[PDB]
Design a binder for this molecule. Structure first.
Ligand SMILES: Nc1ncnc2c1ncn2[C@@H]1O[C@H](COP(=O)(O)OP(=O)(O)OP(=O)(O)O)[C@@H](O)[C@H]1O
Ligand SMILES: Nc1ncnc2c1ncn2[C@@H]1O[C@H](COP(=O)(O)O)[C@@H](O)[C@H]1O
Ligand SMILES: [Ca+2]
Ligand SMILES: [Mg+2]
Ligand SMILES: [Mg+2]
Lengths: 129, 750, 724
């Protein structure tokens, strides 16, 4: 089960990298799609993935197949260290709350009431889950 | 279970293969028609502009001209230098721009500060500087006229005569495409309308024309398994439906509807007067193909199940259908031959209710409209076109000798020479009376064409679009020094398929609009509460905008919500609501002149009103035959201005998004080659390439910017001992947006 | 003229919208007669200093500037500032800045209080609001509309109005006088305030311009659903001195002294005040009256009109109010022109004239007998007709009615005449253009396109030939307008024959109704263009709306002495309803824009060849009176493009005064010679009776073997056609 926004982003990226517009993407464009989506596969992992899921004699990937691929890849790279880096982007460990409203209202995907009531040590909020 | 299409998109050298010869035949003279090259003329004019800039600098009187013009010139010079790849030309452009920067820094500190702020954000700061009404000022042409002391050639004169409302029409391909894509942004206040006390100039179609003249010819290849490619055997079966008049539900057109114990309907479609058996065979085969590939194509409509195609005795048909109240009229339609061919299928009852039927509620109408739109555009992506969804006519007067044959053209300004806006729709309600859009979904699937019939000479395109395929002629185009008529329009002979593709998309959307208008007109006719009528029409306008957003999403893959936002930037839903409610109901026919003008004032706010020197027939309104209402006065333009703006915005968004993606990948290939050592250049050139790639990203799209940021990080790693203070704010903003997305996703998850 | 206007400019509209959304469209934050009002069920929060008031003040500023420009263009001397500049020198950019400032003048008000402390507080708040708005949008104003922040500060200081300085610069004068004059409607004594404001404004523009401003103000009030107060010179109310309040009193003897509650003295009245020599010699309103309210309706209808949902719409919708003001301004531009001339009876071409029936018959015989044409003359059964006869026919006959006198037999005989002629015609413009033969061209065209020979196809082909083939219509138009240089007699004859035929074909084959706006393109040199602009400015400068004085005779004299419609008539001019076509095909440096709201031009559509193109033959009773001249960009060559806007006005005052008999005397000579010939062959009283009458058409009509009888029957029929 993937979030609706994640599905929309995946569909847009897949459509963008489908050059001939036949609904499938070849194996030489999967790496770029993964880099764009955030996951940077290694050469060994990329080669294994290509030879595993795209060795049916066609060499093309349809969108449901791509979604299964992406869910499988994300199943093993959901470590919280990524969220730690995201919070570290904005070394005190205490991040101004006045910046959080600004960012959450004028950046990214536009509920902020709960953000302000939760109130900020980013690591502590991460442990709050 | 695999989902994909049997059609592929590529590019060819030219669509001009077996077209009619480019000749105009007058009383007794043959006038050859010639193309005016677009890119070469534009480049010549840009070079002339550069020489004029040099003349301005030499005249050293910069203190006499407005600082706004100097800022425009400087920003365009910087953006053009960034676009240019040759070292010599880039250096020349930068040296030519240096004096203006010096003067601005010395004498206009605040304008210089603003210019630097713009420079730090983009490699093409001119496109962001022109995200508002400043685009209505053509500074390039003004300078060219001021400092070019010799006449322009005929080609240059024609280009100036066509593209003169803005200087963006002289931008090179990447810059123009980026500006067009970004003009739909939320922060953009640009709208292609220049208003003065004298007159108002709507030039939305000029943006699409200038875009299309920059595109390569397109081709669609249909796979060997496609419906129009593979061969199929005859209709092998011995099915023979038993017609019993004791269970004849009704007669619809030339079709007999019988009931079944399963609550479905059996439809017997009898041969038409002039049609051959091949038509019914094609309908049968298309039904089988769609029913078989439903899962692959993800079509949501309820397709009919065909049962047989054979011949029956006419006397039997007359005997079965004797008791029907419409038997007399049904008799005329069927063929008068002794023997009749028939096509039998099974469908649900909703397959025979039209999408404009008043008995539906708004929710059911919304669901059916969504289904029909999705099916139409997915089948378009698959290579199938339905030119006969509805029977829409611009006019019937002298239709035989008209080039268009009276068929309504959605993008009329693009397919003809010297046509400036959409015209009247004759008997608009009767056009969609028997529309092939049904409550269940699509219908009448046998009347379809392959998409390749739009990119090549064929019965359809030759019959309806001969002017586009032949070339444009006007006496002012005739050059006596060569004996030929030269025009930019004739060049379209190389790309007419690209125009016809967008024309088909716009025609689908127009049919949807007419069906929604018919529903609204029928439903609110007997209502008395004005707020209820307004609510109905407002919901219908929302449905129309959502349908256009769905078309954009299916064609380009943009998320539907973002597509709706982009459409709403350019087209106003409130004005569309008002105009559709006003002009598609008979109420306006029962007003005197004062009240009519006063209402029109609110219908078209901030724009000229609709004028017509016609006589309104009470109870109907505008009508040439006097009984059936039209949309627009005789020989005038259609009063639905917002609809034209919406259609042009939709097609422009689709085409511009494809072109911007093409430019983005063109630049990405160069970036990748540079970053792997294939091309040898210093750090500054690499960072310039990556910054350009960043500027070539979709508006509102983040994963493209994430990819560009990753490439920037890799390049910076490749050049650790280099300065990057210039390219730091933009990538820092991108990184911050990425972090904000990560935090928002994590939070909303929990 | 320029593109910029209050009613179409977008930055001014954005400023007004911001002001309304933030300040004017909000409830008052105090209690001094500050209760929101109800109009047609909608709430108007500020009905005295709301959106309508600000828009009207901005309109007043623009109107004052335009009237000052006209007054300067009339040769009057205007008041000067500390430098030599006058009000007429204000440029469009300065006007834009002034109007953007004016949009925020009353934004800072909190109540209707009129004390000095509240005045200063409110103006300070308005200044702060203007500065905040400019700062918020400085990304698109500070470089573009305002030179820099210093200019913004100057305009903010104007808005603040700390020192009561109302004459230092044009901005001060315009803003303050617009705001003040907007209140003529409410002030209880109307005559005193009107005199004060008229005197205050007259020193900057003049008496005529002030009258025009105050006459258009009433139309602006009517368009915005505001009450219009009447002016009564014979008012018995005590006179009020607007400066302060000090009323005037008369001594015991009776003369003014040069509250007092004096024992044997009473306050001077308004009527007495307006009679003073120092006032009546400078105020045109002395001894004159203005009827209040809306004319043509009773008090109940007026009260209903003022209390309506439209008042709320004007007070709450920026675009609606702007459109109302724009329509009022256009109507006020057009009205004085119609006021200055007599009233036309109808909208139809007049019946055929005696001088034109003979011309139609002469054309008919010429067409029917092509052999009658010689090298350079026409020897028609006795009479030699030369180039000048046909030139006078072109210059003195309304060829539309002459064509109305023709029948399809002439359309048929076109082929016979063209077969006879097979001569050559020359381009009037661009002489080096490879001349062509006309008879061969017509014969070939008819043989390839119209083999059946139907009359309708012939009419369509003739219209097409007129609409295209520069080599034909250039010469035909040049001859028709008497601009031709080096024209052969054959060309003149062909022109005079084809003009009425082309008119008849257009009338017969046309089906659309006449559009209300048409455009024509002309290619002209710079010197001729400057002359035309001077003529048009002379037209425009003298056309003003009246308040008290009647200035119609001056406008009539200037228009009659300077008419510019001469270069539009006498020919089948081609026009189009779309200016884009003109700018796209010909790119003419001069463009004439004709407005025909009444349908006086009898425009006929030209068949598809072109669906937006029409043909106009200007009636002799219709004059094109310019209303504005605009500089609109440059053509593709880089030359300035000028657009002249005309309004078609019909009146007998524009009927040309020609001398009759120019075409009839040769006619009666024709029948006289024919009768003399037949009777000489015969050799009885009829011959001497008809001959004795020489070149006197009325006397001739008083006066008037089988072949001879046929001859007299033909002559008779000719005479009864002439009399009818
Ligand atoms: N639903 C209908 N009800 C009544 N008359 C109809 C209907 N559909 C068509 N007609 C009439 O019958 C004529 C012949 O029908 P037509 O050829 O348009 O059928 P069709 O569009 O192929 O059928 P369908 O849409 O049901 O598959 C039409 O021109 C019209 O006059
Ligand atoms: N086939 C067409 N479809 C839609 N509008 C048209 C078509 N042909 C012309 N128009 C427009 O209709 C108006 C009248 O043109 P015409 O019908 O060609 O006389 C103009 O605004 C044309 O641009
Ligand atoms: Ca693919
Ligand atoms: Mg059908
Ligand atoms: Mg059909």
């Amino acid at each position: 089960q993937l979030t609706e926004e994640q599905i929309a982003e995946f569909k847009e990226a897949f459509s963008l990298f489908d050059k001939d517009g036949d609904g499938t993407i070849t194996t030489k464009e999967l790496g770029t799609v993964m880099r764009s989506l955030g996951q940077n596969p290694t050469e060994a992992e990329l080669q294994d993935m290509i030879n595993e899921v795209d060795a049916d004699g066609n060499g093309t990937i349809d969108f449901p197949e791509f979604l299964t691929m992406m869910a499988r890849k994300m199943k093993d790279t959901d470590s919280e260290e990524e969220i730690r880096e995201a919070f570290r982007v904005f070394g005190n460990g205490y991040i101004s709350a006045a910046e959080l409203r600004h960012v959450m209202t004028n950046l990214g995907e536009k509920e902020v009431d709960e953000m302000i009531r939760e109130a900020v040590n980013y690591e502590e909020f991460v442990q709050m889950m | 279970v695999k989902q994909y299409y049997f059609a592929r998109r590529g590019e060819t050298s030219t669509h001009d293969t077996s077209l009619p010869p480019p000749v105009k035949v007058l009383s007794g003279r043959s006038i050859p028609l010639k193309e005016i090259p677009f890119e070469a003329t534009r480049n010549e004019l840009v070079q002339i502009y550069l020489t004029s800039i040099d003349k301005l600098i030499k005249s050293n009187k910069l203190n006499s001209i407005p600082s706004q013009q100097i800022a425009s010139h400087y920003l365009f010079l910087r953006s053009l230098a960034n676009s240019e790849t040759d070292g010599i030309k880039k250096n020349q452009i930068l040296s030519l721009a240096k004096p203006l920067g010096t003067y601005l820094a010395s004498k206009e500190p605040h304008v210089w500060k603003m210019i630097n702020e713009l420079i730090e954000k983009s490699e093409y700061p001119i496109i962001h500087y022109l995200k508002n009404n400043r685009a209505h000022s053509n500074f390039m042409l003004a300078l060219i006229h001021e400092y070019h002391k010799e006449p322009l050639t005929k080609n240059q004169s024609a280009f100036v005569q066509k593209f003169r409302d803005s200087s963006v029409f002289l931008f090179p391909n990447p810059i123009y495409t980026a500006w067009l894509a970004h003009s739909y942004d939320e922060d953009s206040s640009f709208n292609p309308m220049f208003r003065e006390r004298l007159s108002t100039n709507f030039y939305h179609s000029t943006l699409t024309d200038n875009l299309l003249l920059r595109t390569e010819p397109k081709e669609v290849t249909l796979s060997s398994e496609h419906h129009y490619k593979k061969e199929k055997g005859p209709i092998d079966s011995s099915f023979r439906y038993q017609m019993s008049s004791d269970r004849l539900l009704r007669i619809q057109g030339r079709t007999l509807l019988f009931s079944t114990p399963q609550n479905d309907v059996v439809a017997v479609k009898v041969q038409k007067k002039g049609e051959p058996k091949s038509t019914l065979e094609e309908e049968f085969e298309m039904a089988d193909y769609l029913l078989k590939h439903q899962r692959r194509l993800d079509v949501h409509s309820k397709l009919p199940q065909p049962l047989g195609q054979y011949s029956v005795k006419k006397s039997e048909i007359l005997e079965i259908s004797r008791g029907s109240l419409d038997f007399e009229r049904f008799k005329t339609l069927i063929d008068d031959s002794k023997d009749l061919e028939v096509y039998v299928y099974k469908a649900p009852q909703s397959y025979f209710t039209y999408l404009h039927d008043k008995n539906q509620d708004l929710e059911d109408l919304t669901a059916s409209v969504k289904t029909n739109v999705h099916d139409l555009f997915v089948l378009l992506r698959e290579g199938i076109v339905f030119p006969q969804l509805a029977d829409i006519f611009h006019t019937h007067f002298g239709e035989d000798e008209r080039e268009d044959k009276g068929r309504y053209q959605a993008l009329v300004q693009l397919l003809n020479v010297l046509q400036f806006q959409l015209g009247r729709i004759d008997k608009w309600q009767k056009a969609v009376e028997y529309v092939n859009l049904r409550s269940s979904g699509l219908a009448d699937l046998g009347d379809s064409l392959p998409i390749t019939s739009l990119f090549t000479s064929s019965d359809f395109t030759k019959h309806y679009f001969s002017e586009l395929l032949t070339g444009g002629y006007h006496p002012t185009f005739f050059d006596k020094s060569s004996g030929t008529a030269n025009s930019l329009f004739t060049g379209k002979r190389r790309l007419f398929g690209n125009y016809l593709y967008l024309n088909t998309i716009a025609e689908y959307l127009l049919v949807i609009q007419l069906t929604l208008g018919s529903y609204g007109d029928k439903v609110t006719r007997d209502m008395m509460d004005k707020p209820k009528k307004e609510a109905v029409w407002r919901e219908l306008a929302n449905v129309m905008f959502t349908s256009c957003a769905e078309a954009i999403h299916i064609m380009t893959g943009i998320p539907q919500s973002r597509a709706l936002t982009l459409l709403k930037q350019r087209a106003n839903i409130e004005k569309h609501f008002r105009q559709t409610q006003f002009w598609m109901t008979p109420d306006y026919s029962k007003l005197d002149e004062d009240t009519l003008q006063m209402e029109q004032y609110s219908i078209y706010s901030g724009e000229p009103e609709y004028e017509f020197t016609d006589k309104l027939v009470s109870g109907v309104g505008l009508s040439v035959d006097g009984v059936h209402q039209d949309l627009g006065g005789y020989n005038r333009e259609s009063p639905l201005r917002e609809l034209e703006k919406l259609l042009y915005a939709t097609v422009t968004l689709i085409e511009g998004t494809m072109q911007l993606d093409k430019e983005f990948f063109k630049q990405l290939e160069q970036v990748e080659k540079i970053l792997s050592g294939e091309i040898k250049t210093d750090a500054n050139s690499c960072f310039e390439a990556v910054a350009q790639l960043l500027d070539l990203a979709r508006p509102g799209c983040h994963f493209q910017k994430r990819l560009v940021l990753s490439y920037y990080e890799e390049a910076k790693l490749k050049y650790p001992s280099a300065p990057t203070d210039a390219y730091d704010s933009r990538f820092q903003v991108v990184a911050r947006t990425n972090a904000a997305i990560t935090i928002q996703r994590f939070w909303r998850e929990a | 003229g320029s593109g910029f206007s209050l009613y179409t400019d977008d930055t001014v509209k954005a400023a007004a919208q911001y002001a309304y959304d933030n300040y004017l469209g909000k409830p008052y934050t105090g209690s001094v007669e500050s209760a929101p009002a109800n109009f047609g069920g909608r709430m108007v929060y500020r009905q005295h200093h709301g959106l309508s008031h600000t828009l009207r003040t901005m309109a007043y500023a623009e109107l004052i500037v335009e009237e000052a420009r006209k007054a300067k263009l009339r040769g009057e001397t205007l008041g000067k500032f500390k430098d030599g500049r006058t009000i007429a020198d204000v440029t469009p950019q300065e006007l834009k800045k002034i109007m953007i400032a004016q949009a925020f003048f009353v934004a800072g008000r909190d109540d209707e209080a009129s004390d000095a402390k509240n005045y200063q507080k409110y103006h300070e708040q308005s200044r702060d609001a203007f500065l905040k708005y400019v700062k918020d949008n400085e990304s698109t104003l500070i470089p573009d509309v305002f030179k820099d922040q210093e200019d913004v500060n100057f305009y903010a200081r104007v808005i603040e109005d700390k020192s009561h300085d109302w004459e230092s610069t044009p901005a001060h004068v315009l803003i303050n006088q617009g705001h003040m004059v907007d209140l003529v409607r409410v002030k209880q004594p109307p005559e005193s305030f009107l005199q004060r404001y008229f005197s205050s404004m007259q020193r900057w523009i003049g008496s005529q311009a002030t009258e025009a401003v105050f006459g258009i103000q009433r139309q602006f009030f009517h368009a915005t659903y505001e009450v219009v107060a009447g002016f009564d010179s014979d008012n018995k109310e005590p006179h009020l001195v607007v400066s302060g309040l000090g009323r005037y009193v008369i001594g015991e003897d009776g003369q003014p002294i040069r509250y007092k509650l004096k024992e044997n003295e009473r306050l001077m009245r308004v009527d007495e005040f307006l009679k003073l020599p120092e006032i009546q010699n400078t105020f045109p309103g002395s001894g004159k009256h203005l009827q209040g309210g809306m004319p043509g309706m009773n008090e109940m209808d007026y009260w209903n009109r003022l209390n309506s949902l439209n008042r709320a719409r004007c007070e709450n919708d920026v675009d609606f109010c702007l459109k109302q003001l724009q329509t009022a301004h256009d109507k006020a531009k057009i009205e004085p022109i119609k006021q200055a001339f007599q009233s036309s009876k109808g909208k139809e071409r007049r019946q055929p004239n005696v001088d034109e029936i003979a011309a139609a018959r002469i054309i008919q015989q010429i067409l029917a007998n092509p052999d009658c044409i010689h090298d350079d003359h026409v020897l028609i059964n006795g009479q030699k007709l030369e180039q000048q006869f046909f030139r006078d026919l072109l210059a003195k006959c309304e060829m539309a009615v002459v064509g109305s006198l023709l029948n399809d037999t002439d359309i048929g005989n076109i082929d016979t005449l063209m077969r006879h002629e097979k001569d050559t015609e020359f381009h009037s413009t661009n002489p080096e253009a490879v001349p062509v033969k006309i008879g061969e061209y017509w014969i070939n065209d008819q043989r390839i396109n119209n083999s059946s020979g139907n009359i309708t196809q012939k009419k369509h082909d003739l219209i097409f030939l007129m609409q295209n083939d520069a080599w034909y219509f250039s010469r035909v138009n040049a001859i028709a307008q008497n601009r031709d240089k080096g024209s052969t007699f054959k060309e003149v004859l062909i022109t005079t024959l084809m003009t009425p035929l082309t008119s008849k074909a257009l009338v017969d084959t046309s089906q659309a109704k006449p559009p209300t706006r048409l455009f024509r393109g002309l290619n002209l040199s710079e010197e001729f263009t400057k002359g035309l602009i001077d003529q048009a400015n002379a037209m425009i400068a003298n056309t003003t709306e009246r308040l008290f004085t009647d200035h119609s005779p001056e406008a009539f004299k200037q228009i009659k002495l300077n008419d510019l419609s001469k270069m539009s008539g006498r020919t089948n001019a081609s026009t189009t309803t779309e200016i884009k076509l003109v700018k796209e095909t010909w790119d003419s440096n001069v463009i004439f824009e004709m407005l025909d709201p009444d349908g006086l031009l009898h425009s006929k559509q030209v068949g598809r060849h072109t669906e937006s193109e029409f043909s106009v033959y200007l009636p002799e009773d219709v004059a094109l009176v310019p209303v504005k001249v605009t500089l609109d960009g440059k053509t593709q060559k880089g030359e300035n493009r000028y657009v002249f806007t005309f309004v078609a006005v019909k009146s007998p005052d524009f009927t040309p005064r020609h001398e009759s008999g120019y075409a009839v005397e040769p006619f009666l000579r024709m029948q006289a010679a024919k009768l003399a010939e037949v009777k000489s062959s015969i050799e009885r009283e009829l011959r001497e009776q008809i001959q004795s009458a020489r070149q006197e058409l009325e006397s001739l009509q008083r006066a008037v073997e089988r072949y001879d009888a046929l001859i007299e029957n033909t002559s008779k029929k000719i005479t009864e056609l002439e009399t009818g």
